Structures are given as C-alpha cells and as structure tokens.
Amino acid sequence: SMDYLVTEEEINLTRGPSGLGFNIVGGTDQQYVSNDSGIYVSRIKENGAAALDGRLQEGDKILSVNGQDLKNLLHQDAVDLFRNAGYAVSLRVQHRLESSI
C-alpha cells in the first residue's frame, strides 16, 4: 500500500483569547466528497492557536479530539467535540499528501 501518502501526529493546542482558529468540514450528513464522511481541516486562521503552533495543516483529517473518535459522526457532533473543550485540546490528525476531487 501507498503508506507514504499519509502520516499521523498528535497535536496539543492551548486555547487563548484568539481561539483555536481553524475551520472544519465533513461528517456523515455533510460528506466533503462523495462517500467520504471524514472530518477535515479546511482553513487555518492567522493568529489563532493552531497557526502559532504550526503543526496543523489544511487538508488534515482529524481522527480524534481529547480521546474522542471522529469516525462517522454528524458534522455538528464533531464540531461540539471541539467547541465544548476547555483550554487544552489534544488532536490526533492524519497529514495527507492527497486531496480528494
């Protein structure tokens, strides 16, 4: 298999006044491309925690947040896992060379 197309990374962010500062897409009810229910990072905002930390990449697939898996969740349920979090947020992500068309 083409394993070199993906890696994974644990990313830990500290939430300050500027917020985490990224946007997500996806979910079982909002598939980013046909037949893919994954949650992906669409945009990283300048001056948010994610941009300052530098590890998060646009196109990353988010696999878990604070140990809660983001496999086959509704879009809002995924969003809630982030927005209900506190000051410390742990993410497991898949960095992807591919983008889906």
Side-chain angles (χ1 to χ4, degrees), residues 1-70 72-101:
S1 47
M2 299 178 301
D3 292 348
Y4 65 90
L5 297 175
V6 295
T7 69
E8 293 187 13
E9 190 171 24
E10 190 79 8
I11 298 170
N12 291 277
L13 299 180
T14 302
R15 189 208 299 277
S18 296
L20 300 176
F22 63 96
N23 295 345
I24 64 171
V25 294
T28 54
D29 59 336
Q30 306 191 4
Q31 297 187 321
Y32 197 40
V33 296
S34 182
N35 202 37
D36 180 355
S37 296
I39 305 300
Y40 298 92
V41 176
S42 56
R43 180 186 173 189
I44 300 171
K45 293 176 176 171
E46 288 197 327
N47 310 137
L52 273 58
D53 171 281
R55 292 174 295 182
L56 200 65
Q57 304 168 19
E58 295 181 355
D60 280 355
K61 190 175 185 187
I62 316 286
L63 301 166
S64 66
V65 44
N66 293 324
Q68 302 158 289
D69 288 348
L70 300 151
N72 303 310
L73 293 177
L74 298 166
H75 183 83
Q76 191 58 47
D77 288 336
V79 171
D80 293 345
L81 297 175
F82 299 90
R83 296 210 57 178
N84 288 328
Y87 70 84
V89 185
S90 190
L91 299 184
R92 180 163 69 261
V93 307
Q94 185 183 66
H95 299 304
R96 291 167 62 247
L97 296 190
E98 298 175 300
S99 296
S100 319
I101 307 300

